[PDB]
Structures are given as structure tokens and as C-alpha cells.
Symmetry: D2
Subunit: 237 residues, 4 copies
Amino acid sequence: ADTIVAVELDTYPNTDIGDPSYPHIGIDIKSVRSKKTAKWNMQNGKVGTAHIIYNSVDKRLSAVVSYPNADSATVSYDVDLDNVLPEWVRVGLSASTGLYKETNTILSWSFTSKLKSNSTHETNALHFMFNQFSKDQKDLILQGDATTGTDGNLELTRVSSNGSPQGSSVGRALFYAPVHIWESSAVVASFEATFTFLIKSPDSHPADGIAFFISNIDSSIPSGSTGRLLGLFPDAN
Amino acid sequence: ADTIVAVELDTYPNTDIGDPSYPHIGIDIKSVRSKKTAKWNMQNGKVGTAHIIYNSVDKRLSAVVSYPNADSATVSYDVDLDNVLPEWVRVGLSASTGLYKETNTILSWSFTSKLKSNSTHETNALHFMFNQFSKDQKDLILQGDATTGTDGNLELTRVSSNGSPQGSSVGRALFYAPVHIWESSAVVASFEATFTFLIKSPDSHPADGIAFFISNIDSSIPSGSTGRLLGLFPDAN
Amino acid sequence: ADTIVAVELDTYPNTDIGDPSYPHIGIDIKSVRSKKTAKWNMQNGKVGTAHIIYNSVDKRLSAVVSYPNADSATVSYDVDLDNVLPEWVRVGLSASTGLYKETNTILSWSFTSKLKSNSTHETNALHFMFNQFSKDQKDLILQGDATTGTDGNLELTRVSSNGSPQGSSVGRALFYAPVHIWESSAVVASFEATFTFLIKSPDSHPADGIAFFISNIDSSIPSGSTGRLLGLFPDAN
Amino acid sequence: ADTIVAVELDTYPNTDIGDPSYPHIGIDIKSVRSKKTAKWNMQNGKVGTAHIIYNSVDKRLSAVVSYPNADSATVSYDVDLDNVLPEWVRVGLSASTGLYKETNTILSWSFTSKLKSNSTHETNALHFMFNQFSKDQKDLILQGDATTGTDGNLELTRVSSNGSPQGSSVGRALFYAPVHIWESSAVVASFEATFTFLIKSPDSHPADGIAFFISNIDSSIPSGSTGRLLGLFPDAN
Ligand SMILES: [Ca+2]
Ligand SMILES: [Ca+2]
Ligand SMILES: [Ca+2]
Ligand SMILES: [Ca+2]
Ligand SMILES: [Mn+2]
Ligand SMILES: [Mn+2]
Ligand SMILES: [Mn+2]
Ligand SMILES: [Mn+2]
């Protein structure tokens, strides 16, 4: 099985796998049963923004989510990612629906990783920024039901020709290049990610959510990971 | 009196003001008596690099210092800088000598500050990078004995025409623009700084050190702040 | 008199000073009588974006302006800016109204300048990005009628309490730090700027326009530079 | 055959394929017979730096090369790259030796590409920076004799265990992700690259050179492209 670290924007409360009884933001370390959660006042049909930050000095994975005109939600968890993830990873976005559903539309995604060595300075970095997505977006690896180019956006889960979200859908987008998150000479390693999203549903109960994740380079959607598993995990262990 | 937050590279042990009995890196919050220190294996005559990082989510000020071919030293301290510093600050480098002495030569200095609001994204930033310093470096405010342009470098303390460091010297360089470190709409604020330095002395006992600092915009060198006070503090309280 | 280089977004045709008979984008080198113009299909009440680029190898000042859902306009002019401007400059935005009027609202402004020397690499840079403007925006020098903080924006010219633009107004905003655009060791120097603007008027004939400019560090609004002079020039020579 | 655009640092004069009678920098558009050259005072055994710049407004490919303590060389050529290259490309470094030889050592490589659309702003970008290269550098595609990790560097051509360069060698390194250089909504597209290199030879006549290139995504070393063909072209047409 893959190795996954993720920040989840979890729209549906599954209380038997430890979700709180409300939409929430969570930090997931090798399990869908988040290590830490915070209440998230999710707004159906509004564009929101998520930010994720980490560095190897402090060893704290943190995230913040907001909408215009609204207060933010934040969550943090102390974890040494070099003890969880391999030295080379891929980074991605994932989303799912089940019997309950929503659009999982990404309007923008940026990421920056840096490795500073002890050689005079000495800086190594990767940065990408998407503010549109075209039909043939060659620097993304699309998995499952994910598509690019409809209204210039990344649709992680299936949307009907009329714009209605579909149930029982899972999809992911991974950046094409592998990312180097640990190196033996690094004195500080850091990453930051931001994405803007639009979660809409005809229903009072949207599901299931969107996640930013970091994985082994060869990660793939686990079998049966629709719905509450967010396209990330094979089971709820 | 000014308000100062600093990371010190302290080359001389002053044990009556709480220094450990060796060169050390420290976090200074409104006092020269560091809140946290770590041992620093300072190398006379070699170029080193320091990195300083902070964000408002985690509220942890961290620093790392290294030389080529050597292990690093690191220190961290939990502190909410919005409860210490004003909303607008200046950022700078400071150094001093006393009866013991050293060169306090800066070969490069970079800084990045970011304020992310809840408006769609919404990013505000300041970045500067110096890899040389000319004679008339109009975007630096020089204080005390600091000069620019000798061999293209920033000499924080006085150096004789022959290159010998002088005693009883203090000097600082502040970036010209004020820096916005808190704003009411920000959901995450962060800063990072890096500088490369060359501390050389003819003597077995160099003094006194170099610091990266953040201050009120109108900060000036305190009277009598040569030597152990690092150009930062009026007394050792 | 100041030395000015500017890219104008000129909303009102003043045919006796060489304007074409339509709104236009122009390159202004020490005169309001542009060296080069292109037709600009200005849209009253819509948010547009302008981009300005230059480097010292090619010695070509270029600009592009667009709106969502619309084609762009572009203009270029061959000019060695080191023969026009001093080594240190300030950068700014300017706008004016006369007997005809418009709002001259800035929603965002970014700028990046780089100087690459022949020392191993060797990079020097300044970058700033504003996506909001607060009441007391200490890193901007405001001149004339310019204000910050109304709806989080920079209003270059006066707007009544009800939001109606006023006539006979001029205002500018300059970044606080001086900018180094030439240095003797530089092998390549470049700059880029972007700003987003909202020009609205109750009238079929808006005036007078918005400009991005580069000037001597001590530049000030010339006497009598309302209206067709764009807050930039003392006369129409 | 591949499609190649390159900036060559050509160390050996092959006068029957149009080289000048001295080491030179050149712009190569689909042929090893440069469209434009400039004299290059190459220094055996010293670390140099090359810079390459282009944007779609000006349609001018420019390059500058220098050493510390020395004047620069520059070359430019007017060319619309959207009429030469496909919309998606890979970027790389190439080098070769023949019967004459040299080390073709890369100490650092950075690249930035940007696509600005007409949507509010709207920025898309890719950036990478290498200041070291490890043994298993997963974000590089190595071709031919290229290796990474010896003394932390990228050795484009073969070097014996004792450090002597070998003859009859060719090697390339391409960044792993495809790069988007044209898009239908872009109003400005640009790229910049920088690399630092060390060309050393025991011989009074080093050969053959190093190039930065942009190619179709599936580019490979052409058969027989050692020596004067620089690992880029199948023949000297
Ligand atoms: Ca759930
Ligand atoms: Ca001390
Ligand atoms: Ca006019
Ligand atoms: Ca040749
Ligand atoms: Mn959950
Ligand atoms: Mn101390
Ligand atoms: Mn005009
Ligand atoms: Mn040639």
C-alpha cells in the first residue's frame, strides 16, 4: 500500500471512523482517521482557499482554510515527515463522492518546495502555479475521474454535461515531476501549498471532500476508495 | 526604548548575563539574556550561513547556522511575535566589538515576508536579495560604524585600512522600506531571512557577534551598546 | 524638472498633443507626447490588467493591457533606459482627471527588479506585491489626492463619499524603497510590473488615465499636471 | 528528427560549418550553423555563468556569458519561438567531446517559465533551481554519458576515475516535467535560464562545448552527435 500524508477538507461526518459531527479540516498521517481536526464552516457554492505549510526544523504540519467575508479554520500536528515519507515524493489533490455528492472543482493550485544545504548558501527549489487548466495539461498526472479544461478548471470528480455532480466518483491530480523533500546535506527543508476550490451540491448534505496529499512517487487510487476514503486510503484503519 | 526581537550569533561568552561558556546561537526577545541558546562551533576566518524562519500559525521563531564541511547548529523558541512587535517593523543586521574584536563582514542578505488574506487568494509580499553592496547603497539605512562597498561587502563594524578589525565598534544596516508583519485580514503571515558572514580575528578570543533583528521602524543604536550588547540593547536587563 | 519614463493607459484623446483619436496605450520617454501608441478598447466599469517588461540586453520597453473575455493591446519602444534614467529610481502609479473624469482605482500592484552580476551567479533583487491596501500603508509614498484603504483599494484620484469620481484631481503612489536599475558589475538588469485597475465613469467620455512610471527618487507631482498631463509632466512639450 | 532551439557555448572552431575562428556563443534555430554568434573569451579551468532570456512580446532570444573579473559576451536573435517549437517542450543541458576534449561540468542550473493570461491576473509558472546534484536525481532525465553526484555536480560528458575528460562522449540532462511555452489565452509568455559551468582540459584546444536547449518533449540524443554536433543535431545542415 501507498504511504499518504494529507490535509483533508472533509464535508461529510462519518462518526464511526472518528469524524466529528460536522464538516472539518484534518491532518491525516497514514490513516483516514485524522490525527487532529478542527471545525470547518463549509459554504456550499462559494470559492474557498486552503494553505498548507511545513518545515523540517519545526516538524509541524499546519493548514488554514477560509472564504471571503468569513473567519478561518486552522489545524496543526507535530510530526517529523522524514520519518513518515520517502526522500522523493509526488504531491497531489484528491477528491471523492459516494451516495452523497458534490462538485470538487479546483480553480488554482500552487506549491513551493525548498532544500537549503550547508554549501555556500545553498538553495534548491521547485515551484509551480496553476491558475487555469487546459484540456491537455501535460504536467499533471490525472487519475480516476479527474479532468481538466472544463471552464478552464480541474474537476476532480465527475460532473454531468449539465453541471450536476455525480455520485460514486473518485479522482486525483499529481504534479508530473517527483519532489525532493529530504537530502543528506539539507540544513532546512520546507514546503508550502495553496489551492482554491468550489464545492457545490444540490443537496443539504454534500460529500465527501477534497484533500492535498503527499505520497510515494508511484501512488495510485486505492481500490474502493470512493466516498469516505477520499481517494487516499484502501480502508478505514 | 526600542522593541527588539533578534537571532544572535554570539562569539564571546559573557557568563554574568547568562551566556553559556562557549560561542552560541540564541533567540533574544526584548533582552540580551537569550530565551533559548544552542552551542555554536564558530570557525574563525570561514564564510558561514544563517537562516531564520517564522510564521503566525505556528508561532515559533527558529534559526539554523552552518559552515561548508560542518554540521549545523539550531535553536527555536515558541513566541507570538504579534504580542511582542508592532504591526509595522524594520528588519536589519547588527554587530559589535569591545575590548575583544573581530571583523563582522556580510557577504549576502535576503529576506521574504508574506501576508495571505482571506480575499481570493490573496497574497501580499516583500522580498529583497543583496549579493553585493556598493559604496552608495541607497536601499540600506546604515547606522554607527557600518559601511558598504569595501570589496563589495557590508562591514558592520570598523576595519582599518589594512583590514585589521577594530575594537569598541558598533554598526547596523536596516532595509529602507518598513515591513508589514501583521494585518487584520491576514490568515497566515510568515518571514524568512538568510545571511552569509565572515567573522575573522587575529585573536584566540573574537568578540562580540552578529545578529539579525526586527524592530520598531524608528529603531536606532542604543547608547553604550558596544561589546556584549550587540548594538541592540541599552543594558543587560 | 523630474525625469520620467512611463506606460500610459490614456482614456481621453487630446489630439493637439499627438494623441490618436481614441483611448490608447503609450510609451512616454520624458514627454507626454508618446514615442509609440496602440489603440486600446477601454471598458468603462470593468477590471483590467496591465503588464510592463524591460531588460538591459534587449533595451526594449514593452507593455500589454487586457480585460477578461477580450483581446489584448500591446506597445513597444526601443530605448536604452540607462541613457534616460539615473542609476537609482523610484517606481509608481499616477492618475488624473480634469473637466472630464473617472475613478482611477488600483486593486493590485506587483513589481520585480533584478541585477545579475559577473560574480558567481550573482543575483540581486527587489520584489513587492500588493493585493490590498490598508488605511496606513507605510510602504507607499502617497502624493496629491491618492488614498488607501477605501474598500481595501488604492484610489489614485478623489472619489466622493458616494463613490462619484471628481474632476480636477491628481494623485500618485510610489514604493517607499529606492530601486537600483543599473550597477557597474551588472551583466543583465531587468524589471517587470503588473497592476489591476478599475476605471469607471458616469460619462460617455471618461478622462484622463492611469500610468505606471519610473522617476528620479525625489519625484513629485508637477504643478498644473491635472487632466491631460497625467500627474507626470509640467507641460505638453 | 527533433526540433531544437539552443544557446551554444562552442569551445572549438569548426570553420566548415560556419563557426568563427575562435570560441564563441551562438543562437541555434533548428541547425548547428548558428543564426548569430559573438566572440567568447573562454577560460580553461574557471567557473563561468550563462544567462538566457526570451519573451513572446519582443520575440528576441538573448544570452550573456561571463566569468568573475572579466567582461561579458552577449548574443541576440529575433525569432518567434511559437513558430519554431511546439506548445509543450522539455528544457535541458547538452555537451560533447570528440577527438579533442574537455570536462563539461554543471555546478548549478535554474529555469523559470511564466504564462500570463487575460483572466484576473492571471499567472501560471514553473521554476526549478539546482545548486547540487545527487547520485539519484529523480527530477532529471539523463541521456548518454551524463551522470550526477560526483562531487555533487552534473557531469554531462565522461570523466575518468582520475578526473581526466574523455573523448568521443555526449550527454544531456532534461528537466522531468514538460514545460508549457504557449497557450491560447496567454497575453505574455516568458522564460529565463541560468547555469554555472566548469570547462577544463589538459589541452590547448578544448572541445566541443555546452548548450542550453529547448526541444520536443520526447527529444533524444541524435545518432552520431558527438563532437561538433553538441549532442543536439543529426548532421551539420
Ligand atoms: Ca468524512
Ligand atoms: Ca556574549
Ligand atoms: Ca490624453
Ligand atoms: Ca564548434
Ligand atoms: Mn474526516
Ligand atoms: Mn549570548
Ligand atoms: Mn496619450
Ligand atoms: Mn558554433
